[PDB]
Amino acid sequence: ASTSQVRQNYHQDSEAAINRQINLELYASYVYLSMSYYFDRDDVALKNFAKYFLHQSHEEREHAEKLMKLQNQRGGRIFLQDIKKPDCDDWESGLNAMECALHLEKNVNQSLLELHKLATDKNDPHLCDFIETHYLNEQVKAIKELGDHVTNLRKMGAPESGLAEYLFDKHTLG
Amino acid sequence: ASTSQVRQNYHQDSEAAINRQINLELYASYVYLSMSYYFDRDDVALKNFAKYFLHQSHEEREHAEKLMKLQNQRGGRIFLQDIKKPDCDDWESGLNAMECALHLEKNVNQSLLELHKLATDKNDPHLCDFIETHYLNEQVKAIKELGDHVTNLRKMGAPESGLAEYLFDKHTLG
Amino acid sequence: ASTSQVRQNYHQDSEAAINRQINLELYASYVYLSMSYYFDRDDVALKNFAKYFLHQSHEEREHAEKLMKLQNQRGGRIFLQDIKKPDCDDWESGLNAMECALHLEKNVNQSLLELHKLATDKNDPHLCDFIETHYLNEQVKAIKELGDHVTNLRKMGAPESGLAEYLFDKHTLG
Amino acid sequence: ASTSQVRQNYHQDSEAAINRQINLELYASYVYLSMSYYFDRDDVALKNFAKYFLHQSHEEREHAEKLMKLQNQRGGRIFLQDIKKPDCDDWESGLNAMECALHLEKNVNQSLLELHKLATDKNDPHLCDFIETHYLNEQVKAIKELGDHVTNLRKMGAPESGLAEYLFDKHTLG
Amino acid sequence: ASTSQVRQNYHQDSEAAINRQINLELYASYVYLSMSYYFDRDDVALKNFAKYFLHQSHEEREHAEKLMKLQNQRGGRIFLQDIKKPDCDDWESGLNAMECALHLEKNVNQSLLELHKLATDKNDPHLCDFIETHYLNEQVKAIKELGDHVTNLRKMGAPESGLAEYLFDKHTLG
Amino acid sequence: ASTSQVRQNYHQDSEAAINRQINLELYASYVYLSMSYYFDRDDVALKNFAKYFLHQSHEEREHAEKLMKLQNQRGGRIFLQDIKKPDCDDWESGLNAMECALHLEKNVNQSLLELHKLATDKNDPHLCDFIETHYLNEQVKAIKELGDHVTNLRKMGAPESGLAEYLFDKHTLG
Ligand SMILES: [Cl-]
Ligand SMILES: [Cl-]
Ligand SMILES: [Cl-]
Ligand SMILES: [Cl-]
Ligand SMILES: [Cl-]
Ligand SMILES: [Cl-]
Ligand SMILES: [Cl-]
Ligand SMILES: [Cl-]
Ligand SMILES: [Cl-]
Ligand SMILES: [Cl-]
Ligand SMILES: [Cl-]
Ligand SMILES: [Cl-]
Ligand SMILES: [Cl-]
Ligand SMILES: [Cl-]
Ligand SMILES: [Cl-]
Ligand SMILES: [Cl-]
Ligand SMILES: [Cl-]
Ligand SMILES: [Cl-]
Ligand SMILES: [Cl-]
Ligand SMILES: [Cl-]
Ligand SMILES: [Cl-]
Ligand SMILES: [Cl-]
Ligand SMILES: [Cl-]
Ligand SMILES: [Cl-]
Ligand SMILES: [Cl-]
Ligand SMILES: [Cl-]
Ligand SMILES: [Cl-]
Ligand SMILES: [Cl-]
Ligand SMILES: [Mg+2]
Ligand SMILES: [Mg+2]
Ligand SMILES: [Mg+2]
Ligand SMILES: [Mg+2]
Ligand SMILES: [Mg+2]
Ligand SMILES: [Mg+2]
Ligand SMILES: [Mg+2]
Ligand SMILES: [Mg+2]
Ligand SMILES: [Mg+2]
Ligand SMILES: [Mg+2]
Ligand SMILES: [Mg+2]
Ligand SMILES: [Mg+2]
Ligand SMILES: [Mg+2]
Ligand SMILES: [Mg+2]
Ligand SMILES: [Mg+2]
Ligand SMILES: [Mg+2]
Ligand SMILES: [Mg+2]
Ligand SMILES: [Mg+2]
Ligand SMILES: [Mg+2]
Ligand SMILES: [Mg+2]
Ligand SMILES: [Mg+2]
Ligand SMILES: [Mg+2]
Ligand SMILES: [Mg+2]
Ligand SMILES: [Mg+2]
Ligand SMILES: [Mg+2]
Ligand SMILES: [Mg+2]
Ligand SMILES: [Mg+2]
Ligand SMILES: [Mg+2]
Ligand SMILES: [Mg+2]
Ligand SMILES: [Mg+2]
Ligand SMILES: [Mg+2]
Ligand SMILES: [Mg+2]
Ligand SMILES: [Mg+2]
Ligand SMILES: [Mg+2]
Ligand SMILES: [Mg+2]
Ligand SMILES: [Mg+2]
Ligand SMILES: [Mg+2]
Ligand SMILES: [Mg+2]
Ligand SMILES: [Mg+2]
Ligand SMILES: [Mg+2]
Ligand SMILES: [Mg+2]
Ligand SMILES: [Mg+2]
Ligand SMILES: [Mg+2]
Ligand SMILES: [Mg+2]
């Protein structure tokens, strides 16, 4: 119960929202992990898709860690939840994985936007700045990159052209 | 259904057991993550406990990844499950965290030993070698290190001596 | 007849099996040699297929040499046999060569697995360790790589697309 | 009585066997020590035989130390015994010393093989791996080297040719 | 049937003769391989004989490869045959191995001379130049070196003097 | 029986005394070896005590070797005896180990002093100089260091303070 000695201008609702966001970032890490190893299957075998999604997975773990650090910086208390498995076991194709990643990042961005709204409603400028500085532009860039990737794959003839996915793997992700 | 072109001498039971082990390693990663940020709380404030457990968390993620790679190398199919949250939100003390980590690593080791027994019963020497080479000695070393740590903390007067935990933090984990 | 001064715990059946395995490795070297120069024909002209299979040929000669060294280390006696010519003179296509290499490596792996079973039945842990350390994972990696290659070529449109085989030659084997 | 906190899957019989093996390695160290200084006598005066056996003596002390470390890693308890003096005070000749070293290393290897059998019967894969990784191939190489040395000395005309032992000292051990 | 686009002034008899010569070079590689590991036996133990013959074995594999490349350069088609095992399993002595190698190289040289005669009869100056440039002087040098070696071993008292073979191993092959 | 060609002014009693001293130095090496691994136990876990005593163990082996060399330099003949196991299996504490080491080094010093008395009574100045140069001051320094260590541990509150032994381990032995 008793307060943290550091706590100031940090609403309990913001504290809870940061714990939800921690879960979401870990969930995103897990989705990209799954995607990565899909492309490492002997019957998929797109090694640069695999590295690309692994890198993205590790990023998301870093995003979670920074929110954990924030929780403590502000005197909130971290409460972890189960990290749900991804929706898919088999991601179908390079294009479909990229489409799923785009939708994931748009979902994560919507959560961060709700979090910023809350921080604004509770007049927490430090939390607003945090989210702006470390998260919002990183989402806009990720979203733009994924859209670019989907566009290229589509134009190249994916998913039906295995050639298209192979060449994208070498030229864009390589 | 249809076979993987790479698959040879890889029993379905071993395939399932590797998927269980993947979950366990990710679970271990999550426990150490939680422990790490506990020591980063302003009311705990043992920064080298925090770094030590974070490093251990990242290790475990690497151990999971290597099993995922193995699954694919052998032509098995990765099936992920929810990563359960840790048993504890509050780890009490440096000593109690170390005790919990020891029990975690002994549990992980017991799983790997059951996995090796299975691999032996199914006459899978490649899988036996894998487990021996990449996992079993790494467990024995982790277990020994954690026991050493618990011993020192106990001898120093933890958990009642906050001095003991502070000095261990600086001299052993620092 | 009279024993080797070094010989210990080395069954005559293991000695014979190692001589068979020596022949098999040299045979594998010969198959890859043949494949290599097929891709060097003026009417095939895929120079990176050619280098890839030449490298694999030299590897296999090294694998044979290490078994010869082992035979002597254990006090067995090397008995060489004719190295049979490969099954094919003309390997048809990049894809078909890769398919044949996959089947070759799976055959070599099955032989090594039978050899390990024998070594296990004769309670020869040094020989078990030898095979595990120097051979079994090297087979699993070769098999996985070849499967990956076959998958890519298939997805790209080989063997009918001469473009697919040309581009694979440059991007994967180059 | 009470258990070690680290102990897992480590049979008391294996614990005792490791203590016996520790004694044997120290015993081997002592035999090579004695051999070394024999060749340093003014009436023997083969300085490279002396260095060769001293190096081998120090190796064996390292092999003992690694088993001591293992005992502790696994939660067993080290119990030392007297290190018996070697069988011989006077080793007769370079050839006879080499012959005695060959028989010593074959004895040490037989002990390690019995130890591996025990570890296998008690389903201790970590201990099996330990012995395989750190000991069994090191014995096979030592045995092969000693056999090679005995062969050369014999072919050269030792022990009757003092010239043979002198020249072996310079060309093989030098 | 249909011609190679590159083929010019390349008689079918020369094409067949190059395929025979390819087999012979691989056969020579195999003989030297066998010789090499004979000297690696614990009861022979002449390590520089072993390295010398291994080097010669690898050379011969290179000589085969260059003929394979030639076949393709000229638009002929490679047809491989079984590589026969060597005549001997046990090479008796350093001197006898050297004598056998001399006879092998003289046989290989006689084949190359017949090949040059054919190339001359078919007015193939490119093939004549090939053989002259890459093979004939390399044979004359190998033959001279082997004769020199046999002479020295004979003068030193081989094969009865095990000392002679030991010292030759160190001073000439070392 | 017959004399060594090198022997001069070297009494048989001195020869025997050097053989006794060789045994004592090896015995000291063994005591420190045992002490070392005691501190490596998971329930003791003082790693710098362990390194300190291991270093001391290796020193003593060097002291033995130098006496063996001396025996031969003077034309005496080395006669080895069993190296007795240490008095203790369990050394109780850092302080008690240090106390036992102090008593060991004082015993070794008393032996060397008796040896010097003998060398003096037999008018062997070379042996007197040997002992003075290589041994006596090395004992006085070891004794002083061990006394210093015991003093510090005692003042710090050992053996009851596990904190004291931990901090000594880091600051003095570290
Ligand atoms: Cl607040
Ligand atoms: Cl609030
Ligand atoms: Cl939950
Ligand atoms: Cl930007
Ligand atoms: Cl391209
Ligand atoms: Cl299977
Ligand atoms: Cl199955
Ligand atoms: Cl689940
Ligand atoms: Cl280790
Ligand atoms: Cl301090
Ligand atoms: Cl300090
Ligand atoms: Cl045997
Ligand atoms: Cl047998
Ligand atoms: Cl045959
Ligand atoms: Cl691997
Ligand atoms: Cl146990
Ligand atoms: Cl037991
Ligand atoms: Cl005893
Ligand atoms: Cl080896
Ligand atoms: Cl010389
Ligand atoms: Cl023509
Ligand atoms: Cl023609
Ligand atoms: Cl044939
Ligand atoms: Cl010349
Ligand atoms: Cl005298
Ligand atoms: Cl006297
Ligand atoms: Cl005795
Ligand atoms: Cl001084
Ligand atoms: Mg959520
Ligand atoms: Mg891969
Ligand atoms: Mg990202
Ligand atoms: Mg994120
Ligand atoms: Mg669910
Ligand atoms: Mg989706
Ligand atoms: Mg910014
Ligand atoms: Mg589980
Ligand atoms: Mg902090
Ligand atoms: Mg770890
Ligand atoms: Mg793990
Ligand atoms: Mg739950
Ligand atoms: Mg717990
Ligand atoms: Mg290992
Ligand atoms: Mg065969
Ligand atoms: Mg070419
Ligand atoms: Mg290969
Ligand atoms: Mg092979
Ligand atoms: Mg045939
Ligand atoms: Mg085929
Ligand atoms: Mg095994
Ligand atoms: Mg390995
Ligand atoms: Mg014994
Ligand atoms: Mg000397
Ligand atoms: Mg050795
Ligand atoms: Mg040893
Ligand atoms: Mg006795
Ligand atoms: Mg003997
Ligand atoms: Mg090894
Ligand atoms: Mg022929
Ligand atoms: Mg050798
Ligand atoms: Mg040559
Ligand atoms: Mg040739
Ligand atoms: Mg035949
Ligand atoms: Mg012959
Ligand atoms: Mg001409
Ligand atoms: Mg020339
Ligand atoms: Mg004594
Ligand atoms: Mg330790
Ligand atoms: Mg000392
Ligand atoms: Mg001493
Ligand atoms: Mg006793
Ligand atoms: Mg004592
Ligand atoms: Mg002095």
Curated annotation (Swiss-Prot), chains A, B, C, D, E, F:
Binding-site list for Fe cation 1: E25, E60, H63
Q: Which GO terms describe its cellular component?
A: autolysosome; autophagosome; cytoplasm; cytosol; extracellular exosome; extracellular region; ferritin complex; ficolin-1-rich granule lumen
- Segments forming domain Ferritin-like diiron: 8-157
> Which UniProt keywords are listed?
Acetylation, Cytoplasm, Cytoplasmic vesicle, Iron, Iron storage, Lysosome, Metal-binding, Neurodegeneration, Oxidoreductase, Phosphoprotein
Query: Where is it made, tissue-wise?
Result: Expressed in the liver.
What are the subcellular locations of this protein? Cytoplasm; Lysosome; Cytoplasmic vesicle, Autophagosome
Lineage, top-rank taxon, reads: Eukaryota
Q: What catalytic activity does the UniProt entry give for this protein?
A: 4 Fe(2+) + O2 + 4 H(+) = 4 Fe(3+) + 2 H2O
Where is the chain membrane-spanning? none
Instruction: Write the Enzyme Commission number(s) for this entry.
Output: 1.16.3.1
| Record site feature (Essential for association with cargo receptor NCOA4), residues | R20
Q: Could you describe the subunit structure of this protein?
A: Oligomer of 24 subunits. There are two types of subunits: L (light) chain and H (heavy) chain. The major chain can be light or heavy, depending on the species and tissue type. In the human liver, the heavy chain is predominant. The functional molecule forms a roughly spherical shell with a diameter of 12 nm and contains a central cavity into which the insoluble mineral iron core is deposited. Interacts with NCOA4; NCOA4 promotes targeting of the iron-binding ferritin complex to autolysosomes following starvation or iron depletion.
In the UniProt entry, the disease listed is: Hemochromatosis 5: A disorder of iron metabolism characterized by iron overload. Excess iron is deposited in a variety of organs leading to their failure, and resulting in serious illnesses including cirrhosis, hepatomas, diabetes, cardiomyopathy, arthritis, and hypogonadotropic hypogonadism. Severe effects of the disease usually do not appear until after decades of progressive iron loading.
- This chain belongs to which protein, by name? Ferritin heavy chain
Q: Which gene encodes it?
A: FTH1
